[PDB]
Amino acid sequence: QTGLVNSKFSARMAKKTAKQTKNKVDEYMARSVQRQYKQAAVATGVYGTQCTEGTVKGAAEASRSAALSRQFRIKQRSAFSKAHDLFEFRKHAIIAAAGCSYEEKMVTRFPKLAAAMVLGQTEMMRTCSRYVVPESVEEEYMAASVDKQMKRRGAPGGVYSLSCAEGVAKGQAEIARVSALGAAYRAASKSASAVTAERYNSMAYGRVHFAHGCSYEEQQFNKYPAAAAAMRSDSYGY
Amino acid sequence: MKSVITTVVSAADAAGRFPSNSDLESIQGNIQRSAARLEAAEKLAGNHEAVVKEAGDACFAKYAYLKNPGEAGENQEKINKCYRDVDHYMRLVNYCLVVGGTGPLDEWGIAGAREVYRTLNLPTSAYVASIAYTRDRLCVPRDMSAQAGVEFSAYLDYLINALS
Amino acid sequence: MKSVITTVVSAADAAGRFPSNSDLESIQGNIQRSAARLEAAEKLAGNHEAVVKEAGDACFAKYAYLKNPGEAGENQEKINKCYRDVDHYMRLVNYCLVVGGTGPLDEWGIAGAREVYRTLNLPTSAYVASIAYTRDRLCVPRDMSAQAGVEFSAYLDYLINALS
Amino acid sequence: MKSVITTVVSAADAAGRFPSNSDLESIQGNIQRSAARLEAAEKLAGNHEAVVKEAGDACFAKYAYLKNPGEAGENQEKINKCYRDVDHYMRLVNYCLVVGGTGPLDEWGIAGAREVYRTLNLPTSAYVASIAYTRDRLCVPRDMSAQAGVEFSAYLDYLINALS
Amino acid sequence: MLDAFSRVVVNSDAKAAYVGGSDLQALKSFIADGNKRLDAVNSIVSNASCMVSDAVSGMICENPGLISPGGNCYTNRRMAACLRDGEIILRYVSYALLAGDASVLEDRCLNGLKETYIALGVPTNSSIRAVSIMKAQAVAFITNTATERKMSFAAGDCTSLASEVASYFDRVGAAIS
Amino acid sequence: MLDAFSRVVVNSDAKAAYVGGSDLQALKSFIADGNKRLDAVNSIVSNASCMVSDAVSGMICENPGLISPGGNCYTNRRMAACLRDGEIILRYVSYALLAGDASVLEDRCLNGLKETYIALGVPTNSSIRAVSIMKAQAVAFITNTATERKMSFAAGDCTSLASEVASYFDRVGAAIS
Amino acid sequence: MLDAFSRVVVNSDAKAAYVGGSDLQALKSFIADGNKRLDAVNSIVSNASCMVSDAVSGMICENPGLISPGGNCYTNRRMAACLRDGEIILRYVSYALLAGDASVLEDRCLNGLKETYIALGVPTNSSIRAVSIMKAQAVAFITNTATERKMSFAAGDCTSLASEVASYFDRVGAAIS
Numbered sequence A: 001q002t003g004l005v006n007s008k009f010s011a012r013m014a015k016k017t018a019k020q021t022k023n024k025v026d027e028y029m030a031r032s033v034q035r036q037y038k039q040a041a042v043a044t045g046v047y048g049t050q051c052t053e054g055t056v057k058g059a060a061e062a063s064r065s066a067a068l069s070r071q072f073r074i075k076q077r078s079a080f081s082k083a084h085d086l087f088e089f090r091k092h093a094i095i096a097a098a099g100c101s102y103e104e105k106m107v108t109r110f111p112k113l114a115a116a117m118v119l120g121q122t123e124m125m126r127t128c129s130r131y132v133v134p135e136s137v138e139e140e141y142m143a144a145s146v147d148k149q150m151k152r153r154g155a156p157g158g159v160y161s162l163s164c165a166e167g168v169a170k171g172q173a174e175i176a177r178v179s180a181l182g183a184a185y186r187a188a189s190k191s192a193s194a195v196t197a198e199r200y201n202s203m204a205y206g207r208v209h210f211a212h213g214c215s216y217e218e219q220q221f222n223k224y225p226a227a228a229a230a231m232r233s234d235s236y237g238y
Numbered sequence B, C, D: 001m002k003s004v005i006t007t008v009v010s011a012a013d014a015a016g017r018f019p020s021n022s023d024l025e026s027i028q029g030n031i032q033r034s035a036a037r038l039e040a041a042e043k044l045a046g047n048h049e050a051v052v053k054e055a056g057d058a059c060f061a062k063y064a065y066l067k068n069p070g071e072a073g074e075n076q077e078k079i080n081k082c083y084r085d086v087d088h089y090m091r092l093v094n095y096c097l098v099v100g101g102t103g104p105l106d107e108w109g110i111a112g113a114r115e116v117y118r119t120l121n122l123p124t125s126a127y128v129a130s131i132a133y134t135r136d137r138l139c140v141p142r143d144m145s146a147q148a149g150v151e152f153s154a155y156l157d158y159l160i161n162a163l164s
Numbered sequence E, F, G: 001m002l003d004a005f006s007r008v009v010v011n012s013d014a015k016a017a018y019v020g021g022s023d024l025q026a027l028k029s030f031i032a033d034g035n036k037r038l039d040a041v042n043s044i045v046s047n048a049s050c051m052v053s054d055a056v057s058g059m060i061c062e063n064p065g066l067i068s069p070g071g072n073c074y075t076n077r078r079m080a081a082c083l084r085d086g087e088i089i090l091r092y093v094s095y096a097l098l099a100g101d102a103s104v105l106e107d108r109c110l111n112g113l114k115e116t117y118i119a120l121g122v123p124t125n126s127s128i129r130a131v132s133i134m135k136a137q138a139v140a141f142i143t144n145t146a147t148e149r150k151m152s153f154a155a156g157d158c159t160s161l162a163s164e165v166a167s168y169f170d171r172v173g174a175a176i177s
């Protein structure tokens, strides 16, 4: 038979090619790294305080359907925005997997491994922007200044991207309020041993990921680690 | 592509809403003010070759040191590529008159411009000289209408707010 | 500051490790090369008023257009503010010869320079002529030693590569 | 060799005087207008083949009668002597922009030219039409600087005036 | 992200042309029909929520194969997700009517939507019957030719904007096929 | 954030009051004087890159202690950071006069603006001298009494809109004190 | 951060002077004791595993109240963290000996630590006895006067390097007690 462009009737080459198997190995390391980064959260037999979905019975299932629509929007990116997502997650994982050449070797091949590590290593030493509650309005206005610059690529030319968007359906965005309002309280009502492990790891996170030998950026991070945990990668438009 | 239609539907798509009555009303603003900026569009389009020669030589009228050897106007083809860029900026201000906003400047003339002129050793103070010579050369009821000169020149001094 | 000492302590702090013999041997480079990078330290510090005067007008010799009004060289106290800036820079080049790295130039002279010079209408090409005139007027056995002349010029064209 | 220096001391010798405080001011004008006449001269030196190729066939596109039997360019040796005699003239225009006065033109190119060209039947109007072609070929921001075109088109129509 | 204004900009960008008088006559027609354009889409945004349940449950009574057990409309979780993207596809053609062009559509809605229905197992033969019922609704609401909904309006012509939204639904209907 | 339009909502929502006939004339005054308000902020954003150099270089001739060793504008990062928040407070007050209310300053700029400066070491009186120069440019451009740039305008009075932008910089000036 | 070579920069930048013959006698001597300094860090990287166990069990033999139930060594989780942070401050002082200055201690060790240790229930009396006993263990390795382990070195006086680490340990043992 000849190709499907002339005088055929069904789509062919339904076979596991090289690029599908390359996507298949990379999805499986994504289910291993996210397994291993959840091991620090659930380290004993019980689920921790921050592995929670929601509070309302309709809101716990709305966390998945938002996140299932969130992972479609990373797939729905443009070809320039996919390639800038490709190499920037390569760069932020060598800073993550620092001292090993073997751990540096694996991320340069597998591309969804790079998104899996630097999202989970942010949530292993809890340097996320959700898990930190600043102790005062001195640290809060330092934390509220930096993330608005991190929101400045949600609109790159004054028009919004899809990556900053949180409403996907009718009445969707109100669950996205109360899931983070409860996450702000549970971070505030976390244990006293964990929150000072948060500030020291986040001020160690910002000095190696964004300062790079700068005395001024290390000094504000050691004064305000809440602003250090709001600092993220620029591949995330939000 | 910052425009009237584009920034109002991306805010609706950020929250996932339909275009509500706040969103149809912004396009109603693109009938009254869209008569003035589109009337200045073919005024610039019909007379563009007389602009970039007669307002393009004001770069080397004030900044006469660029012709000298060493700097950016040292020969003919770097002088010829200088008149091409003010003609590039005259298209992108003519393209901003028809999108109703700051669209084709912010993607094709502004973003990344402040790193190109550094590494190519092009003085941006010479770029704002030939633009501000077009900014004050405005006899208001003779180029265009009385309000068409406001919306045309609003993108000119926005560019001087961007290049400087 | 980014120096030889400050790099390997941050590399060991990134790994969470003690300073081993890779980090220990980096300071061995501050034993043989610090005899030559400090040879050109006090030659600049002992002659800082001579290099500022007959290279600060070499900015104005290449660019004599600033003496027209509206520009930066239009009055005497602006020129008195102008010689202070290259006296600031050669203080920073002396600050980076005594530190080993390029720290004090980066933390105090280059970071934020591309935002101030565009809004205040200050040509960075007019900065770079005063910097680069000190590079090629420098005689290798007369001004300093042979290896110090390679060392002092290498910090000098980093600033040329910083501004362009 | 009439220049600025070789006239203020050919008058200081005609009265038996020292270098006066008048004549130390006339060499301060040689400091100011040098940078427009040197940069007009160095532009002519790297572009000479191009500008005398176009100036020479402006004679022959205009005057097709010169290839008739007995006329000026009647064979290929005479065409080669026509393009030589406009290569000489713009070399003297390059010389006058270095000396700064009209010295090298009127003692190497103009003195004798009324008597040479009449005897050999070489027309003056074909010599003028080559030099007057490149006087208005000069484009003011594109080719050289603004004031550098003034110096280059001062010696050109000096030569158009002295030939006609 | 573009619209009907910026479509003639990038058409004139590639030939390096200023927007002359021959290109503004479509744009001057576009601002002369802008009052009809907002009056067209304000019948779409008016009762879109009943229009989706008219469409996808109208497809269910048309094709009862999906509500068979094991099918694509069996689970209460699964039918809610079909109502989730059943109104998204009505939302993204409403963005195509404000913009005057379908340039907003295939980079934010149809980009990769074709293979993610194949890989998840969504039957694409019923999805074209799903989007055609809202196509039959949107040519009725902007022509004021519903059965049970006539709205207050100004009379005239809307046959040109009827074919513009009807060219947007089979743009979905050929891309996701 | 709030504006002048929805300020009469929240003042009447706490008393459960309709916005009826007694409250219409405060909003129809915001409409007929609203075309001046678009002519108001057009004089601000046209020159906003040069107002910030007018202000910070105006602070050095009034106070040359900032460029001193130990001064807060000594490092070239710190001059750019002093230049960075020159227009950030100018971008926010341009939002307020379009809004008609200074609420957007009071939750996106001024919530904690005072105490973060003194913990960083920013002097208060120089930032007071920053905004009082920028108050003087704001009233100068808005009536076109600026002595070296005149723009084309329609004739009338903008003293009320001069006082409105002047009622914002002292709100900045009193909160950081 | 700072170091020893950067300290004479910011001492000279505190008056915006240069670095000439006045401040260079401390720095031209610094390269001469650099081979003493690089041999001092090599002594302390060799033996860090026992000298934290020399310290955190010497804290036990004078204070067994943390293995008493309700202490801070009753838990095997907590006894790792007393061993993990017994060497981090040992890692930071070996950073400070390589840097020639204790600049990395007042941001990465000292600042925040007193506000840390109140929120953990840390006995403050255990802080001073842990660092001062390993202070004598530190200079015993530097002056080669360790009475159960010797090392081969080059001859010369080394008490200037023993006093420099003695100026570091009383910094961190002061504020957190």
Ligand SMILES: *[C@@H](C)C1=C(C)C(=O)N[C@H]1Cc1[nH]c(/C=C2\N=C(C[C@H]3NC(=O)C(CC)=C3C)C(C)=C2CCC(=O)O)c(CCC(=O)O)c1C
Binding pocket: A151, A154, A164, A165, A166, A167, A173, A174, A175, A176, A177, A178, A179, A180, A181, A238, B011, B012, B014, B015, B017
């Ligand atoms: C992208 C990252 C955004 C920037 C920048 C921003 O300012 N807001 C983000 C996108 C966005 N969303 C709206 C409208 C809503 N946003 C909501 C989310 C808030 N609710 C929460 O629980 C949290 C977590 C703290 C947040 C941020 C909600 C709710 C809405 C209203 C949706 C509704 O009522 O239907 C807007 C404004 C556009 C608009 O039309 O309102 C933007 C830019």
Ligand SMILES: *[C@@H](C)[C@H]1/C(=C/C2=NC(=C\c3[nH]c(C[C@H]4NC(=O)C(C=C)=C4C)c(C)c3CCC(=O)O)/C(CCC(=O)O)=C2C)NC(=O)[C@@H]1C
Binding pocket: B033, B146, B147, B150, F032, F033, F034, F035, F036, F038, F039, F040, F042, F141, F142, F143, F144, F153, F154, F155, F156, F157, F158, F161
């Ligand atoms: C005081 C602040 C000013 C001044 C203001 C006035 N502006 C007047 C009229 C006016 N301005 C515009 C353009 C404006 N409307 C828009 O929609 C947009 C942008 C999209 C802009 C920039 C218009 C359209 C008008 C109406 C009249 C016209 O068509 O030109 C005005 C007259 C009263 C009024 O119409 O409200 C005044 C007093 N004028 C001044 O002299 C100072 C400097």
Ligand SMILES: *[C@H](C)[C@H]1/C(=C/C2=NC(=C\c3[nH]c(C[C@H]4NC(=O)C(C=C)=C4C)c(C)c3CCC(=O)O)/C(CCC(=O)O)=C2C)NC(=O)[C@@H]1C
Binding pocket: B059, B066, B072, B073, B078, B079, B081, B082, B083, B085, B086, B088, B089, B108, B109, B116, B120, B122, B123, B124, B126, B127, B130
């Ligand atoms: C003349 C008034 C100018 C000047 C112009 C020069 N530009 C040179 C290179 C250059 N410029 C741009 C930006 C411009 N080109 C575009 O296509 C667009 C957008 C549509 C813009 C704004 C680019 C991208 C480049 C590089 C490629 C090119 O040559 O077009 C240039 C040559 C520099 C070089 O080759 O190294 C000159 C001389 N220079 C002046 O002195 C005044 C300010």
Ligand SMILES: *[C@H](C)[C@H]1/C(=C/C2=NC(=C\c3[nH]c(C[C@H]4NC(=O)C(C=C)=C4C)c(C)c3CCC(=O)O)/C(CCC(=O)O)=C2C)NC(=O)[C@@H]1C
Binding pocket: C024, C025, C026, C027, C028, G032, G033, G034, G035, G036, G037, G038, G039, G040, G042, G141, G142, G143, G144, G153, G154, G155, G156, G157, G158, G161
């Ligand atoms: C006091 C704390 C010590 C002690 C210190 C001394 N060390 C001396 C000399 C020395 N050490 C090294 C090796 C060191 N330098 C490096 O560059 C590297 C790694 C890259 C290391 C490990 C060298 C090379 C030298 C110089 C002499 C040699 O070539 O071996 C020293 C002599 C004085 C001086 O050289 O300035 C002293 C006093 N010695 C002691 O006895 C106590 C324990």
Ligand SMILES: *[C@H](C)[C@H]1/C(=C/C2=NC(=C\c3[nH]c(C[C@H]4NC(=O)C(C=C)=C4C)c(C)c3CCC(=O)O)/C(CCC(=O)O)=C2C)NC(=O)[C@@H]1C
Binding pocket: D059, D066, D072, D073, D078, D079, D081, D082, D083, D084, D085, D086, D088, D089, D108, D109, D116, D120, D122, D123, D126, D127, D130
């Ligand atoms: C071309 C534009 C003319 C043309 C010219 C011919 N010129 C002939 C000879 C010639 N040209 C010069 C002047 C020239 N010689 C110099 O040394 C200098 C300055 C340094 C200049 C400008 C001279 C003195 C002569 C005569 C001596 C000689 O042969 O070199 C010439 C030959 C003369 C003849 O036919 O016997 C021609 C044909 N011919 C043209 O058609 C246009 C008018």
Ligand SMILES: C=CC1=C(C)[C@@H](Cc2[nH]c(/C=C3N=C(/C=C4\NC(=O)[C@H](C)[C@H]4CC)C(C)=C\3CCC(=O)O)c(CCC(=O)O)c2C)NC1=O
Binding pocket: A029, A032, A033, A036, A037, A040, A097, A098, A099, A100, A101, A102, A103, A104, A106, A113, A117
């Ligand atoms: C899919 C690919 C894949 C990888 C590349 C690795 C990467 C990796 N390693 C670790 C976890 C670890 N990784 C190491 C390895 C090293 N630490 C060092 O100090 C050495 C320099 C380096 C050896 C080269 C060690 C020792 C641990 C356990 C303790 C720790 O986290 O440091 C973790 C967190 C899980 C945990 O806490 O145990 C991850 C994601 N694991 C993976 O699943």
Ligand SMILES: C=CC1=C(C)[C@@H](Cc2[nH]c(/C=C3N=C(/C=C4\NC(=O)[C@H](C)[C@H]4CC)C(C)=C\3CCC(=O)O)c(CCC(=O)O)c2C)NC1=O
Binding pocket: A034, A037, A038, A041, A050, A051, A052, A053, A063, A067, A070, A119, A120, A121, A122, A123, A124, A127, A128, A129, A130, A131, A179, A180, A183, A232, A236
């Ligand atoms: C390693 C262990 C590990 C976990 C315990 C979970 C952590 C986790 N992430 C999310 C859910 C999320 N987590 C993120 C991640 C981030 N958000 C940001 O602003 C930062 C840039 C970044 C790291 C903090 C995002 C973007 C979502 C979806 C939106 C959201 O609910 O915040 C939820 C749902 C609850 C909620 O946040 O509403 C949970 C439990 N994921 C993990 O991988």
Ligand SMILES: C=CC1=C(C)[C@@H](Cc2[nH]c(/C=C3N=C(/C=C4\NC(=O)[C@H](C)[C@H]4CC)C(C)=C\3CCC(=O)O)c(CCC(=O)O)c2C)NC1=O
Binding pocket: B021, B024, B025, B026, B027, B028, E032, E033, E034, E035, E036, E037, E038, E039, E040, E042, E043, E141, E142, E143, E144, E153, E154, E155, E156, E157, E158, E161
């Ligand atoms: C922000 C909200 C907002 C709107 C809702 C519209 C409202 C609107 N519709 C029309 C006006 C109109 N609208 C239509 C369109 C239609 N008429 C029908 O019966 C069909 C249902 C539909 C066909 C597609 C027609 C035919 C006219 C009159 C002709 C015209 O104005 O071009 C007009 C102009 C006449 C008038 O001023 O009343 C306005 C303002 N514009 C807005 O700014």
Ligand SMILES: C=CC1=C(C)[C@@H](Cc2[nH]c(/C=C3N=C(/C=C4\NC(=O)[C@H](C)[C@H]4CC)C(C)=C\3CCC(=O)O)c(CCC(=O)O)c2C)NC1=O
Binding pocket: B043, B044, B047, B050, B051, B054, B055, B137, B138, B139, B140, B141, B142, B143
């Ligand atoms: C499409 C864009 C467009 C404009 C913005 C104007 C602007 C403008 N005017 C002139 C050219 C001129 N413009 C004026 C006008 C004036 N001189 C004054 O002092 C008054 C303020 C004002 C009356 C309204 C005059 C008198 C000339 C001729 C003088 C000259 O050669 O510049 C030129 C040079 C080429 C030309 O003549 O067109 C340009 C671009 N004309 C245009 O085609």
Ligand SMILES: C=CC1=C(C)[C@@H](Cc2[nH]c(/C=C3N=C(/C=C4\NC(=O)[C@H](C)[C@H]4CC)C(C)=C\3CCC(=O)O)c(CCC(=O)O)c2C)NC1=O
Binding pocket: A142, A145, A146, A149, A211, A213, A214, A215, A216, A217, A220, A221, A227, C106, C107, C110, C111, C112, F077
């Ligand atoms: C709230 C606290 C706070 C900080 C700690 C900094 C941190 C910081 N720096 C940059 C942005 C930057 N940061 C630097 C870094 C430096 N610049 C220099 O002159 C030094 C060499 C080096 C500091 C050591 C550079 C060069 C940029 C511009 C390029 C970039 O976006 O990275 C950005 C992105 C947005 C922006 O440009 O502001 C942020 C958040 N900014 C803040 O608002």
Ligand SMILES: C=CC1=C(C)[C@@H](Cc2[nH]c(/C=C3N=C(/C=C4\NC(=O)[C@H](C)[C@H]4CC)C(C)=C\3CCC(=O)O)c(CCC(=O)O)c2C)NC1=O
Binding pocket: C043, C044, C047, C050, C051, C054, C137, C138, C139, C140, C142, C143, C144
């Ligand atoms: C820190 C760096 C350092 C220096 C730059 C010199 C300091 C120095 N020497 C000269 C001065 C000089 N420098 C030279 C040397 C030369 N001239 C040439 O034409 C040759 C290319 C080259 C020889 C290799 C000469 C001949 C003079 C005297 C003439 C002059 O430049 O005024 C000048 C400029 C004129 C002046 O003020 O005297 C300076 C700054 N010593 C130092 O320690």
Ligand SMILES: C=CC1=C(C)[C@@H](Cc2[nH]c(/C=C3N=C(/C=C4\NC(=O)[C@H](C)[C@H]4CC)C(C)=C\3CCC(=O)O)c(CCC(=O)O)c2C)NC1=O
Binding pocket: E047, E050, E051, E053, E054, E055, E057, E058, E059, E060, E061, E062, E133, E136, E137, E140, E145, E146, E147, E148, E149
């Ligand atoms: C098995 C059950 C079953 C149905 C329910 C209908 C569903 C249905 N309705 C329409 C056709 C239509 N459907 C609607 C939709 C609605 N009318 C409204 O006023 C509301 C907004 C919304 C219901 C809540 C409209 C407006 C039309 C156009 C004709 C009209 O009703 O006036 C069409 C396409 C053309 C047609 O077949 O008629 C279909 C399949 N058909 C079926 O076989």
Ligand SMILES: C=CC1=C(C)[C@@H](Cc2[nH]c(/C=C3N=C(/C=C4\NC(=O)[C@H](C)[C@H]4CC)C(C)=C\3CCC(=O)O)c(CCC(=O)O)c2C)NC1=O
Binding pocket: F047, F050, F051, F053, F054, F055, F057, F058, F060, F061, F062, F133, F136, F137, F140, F141, F145, F146, F147, F148, F149
């Ligand atoms: C030490 C140095 C020094 C300066 C630079 C000026 C700076 C300066 N200018 C003005 C006063 C002003 N400043 C501006 C600002 C500008 N003018 C423009 O046309 C541009 C758009 C922008 C500069 C790029 C304006 C518009 C006025 C009102 C008067 C006018 O220029 O018409 C004021 C307030 C009035 C006062 O208190 O005296 C100050 C401090 N004054 C100084 O003492």
Ligand SMILES: C=CC1=C(C)[C@@H](Cc2[nH]c(/C=C3N=C(/C=C4\NC(=O)[C@H](C)[C@H]4CC)C(C)=C\3CCC(=O)O)c(CCC(=O)O)c2C)NC1=O
Binding pocket: G047, G049, G050, G051, G053, G054, G055, G057, G058, G059, G060, G061, G062, G133, G136, G137, G140, G141, G145, G146, G147, G148, G149
């Ligand atoms: C209560 C229980 C108890 C202990 C566990 C030991 C622990 C201990 N060791 C030392 C004192 C010391 N401890 C060490 C550490 C070591 N010595 C070596 O030779 C090895 C290299 C390394 C073990 C791996 C060193 C080097 C000294 C200094 C004296 C020396 O050993 O020469 C001190 C300080 C003594 C003092 O000043 O009073 C203490 C308390 N002693 C006790 O009373």
